[PDB]
Amino acid sequence: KPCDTMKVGGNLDSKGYGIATPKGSSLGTPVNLAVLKLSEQGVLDKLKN
Amino acid sequence: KPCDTMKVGGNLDSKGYGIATPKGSSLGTPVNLAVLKLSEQGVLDKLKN
Amino acid sequence: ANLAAFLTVERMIESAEDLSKQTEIAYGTLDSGSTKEFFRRSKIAV
Amino acid sequence: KTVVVTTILESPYVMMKKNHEMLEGNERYEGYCVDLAAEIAKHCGFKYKLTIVGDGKYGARDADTKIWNGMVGELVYGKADIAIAPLTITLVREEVIDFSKPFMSLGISIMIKKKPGVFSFLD
Structure with a gap:
């Protein structure tokens, strides 16, 4: 609110938001596993809600 | 057909089908790029339809 | 009056929780698959 | 050079042709x-x-034998090299094999068993 507008029709393309890191970062390997662990735990659904 | 059954409710969880390769495969790197090229081109939408 | 009730009502189990609650109805999944593993490793109550 | 491709007959992803004998x-x-x-x-x-x-x-x-079955067992144990199939991504399988970016999205769902009469005016 205010809800002065609306979404219409369907999704033109399907994509996903993705954490990013520079080439060769040591964070890249663990962030994938962190995302998969959160998905298993269901944390992302709780945050979304 | 026979369409003697029905889907009820909505989707409990969201996931995605993903091509797989053994650890260390030389094909793993290029198959990602092949998938991205197909996604950008919209081939997958045509196959789905 | 009854015709109206038919038409009025017409103008109105269907979820996972309703399935978990109903134990008379049987539900299953593929033996070895992401569905069974997802249910097994899940942490949600339902 | 040739790739060992693993699949399963789960229509419409993979299905044999007519008169496939x-x-x-x-x-x-x-x-x-x-x-x-x-x-x-x-x-x-x-x-x-x-x-x-x-x-x-x-x-x-x-969980007891720590053994892999099906496509994942095949690729991890060397019987093949790739799986262009309706395989689903998950944490456990990523720990042992490398997936690609998903080529299609999905979600769990439930499956169950599923016209005015000429003289409906008497109902």
Whole structure:
């Protein structure tokens, strides 16, 4: 609110938001596993809600 | 057909089908790029339809 | 009056929780698959 | 050079052609996964041979034997090299094999068993 507008029709393309890191970062390997662990735990659904 | 059954409710969880390769495969790197090229081109939408 | 009730009502189990609650109805999944593993490793109550 | 391609007959992803008794080679298989594998090999340039799993299982692990079944057991144990199939991504399988970016999204769902009369005015 205010809800002065609306979404219409369907999704033109399907994509996903993705954490990013520079080439060769040591964070890249663990962030994938962190995302998969959160998905298993269901944390992302709780945050979304 | 026979369409003697029905889907009820909505989707409990969201996931995605993903091509797989053994650890260390030389094909793993290029198959990602092949998938991205197909996604950008919209081939997958045509196959789905 | 009854015709109206038919038409009025017409103008109105269907979820996972309703399935978990109903134990008379049987539900299953593929033996070895992401569905069974997802249910097994899940942490949600339902 | 040729790629060992693993799949399962889960329509419409992979399904045999009509009168397949006389159909052989990669041509005996039609579907969405077979097409996808075609364009993957085209863009990579590699060659592929479509092969089914005898166990007819997508894949899983036995928490006691720590053994892998189906496509995942095949790829991890060397019986193949790639899986252009309706395989689903998950934490456990990523720990042991490398997936790609998803080529289609989905979600769990439930399946169950599923006209005015001429004289409906008497109802």
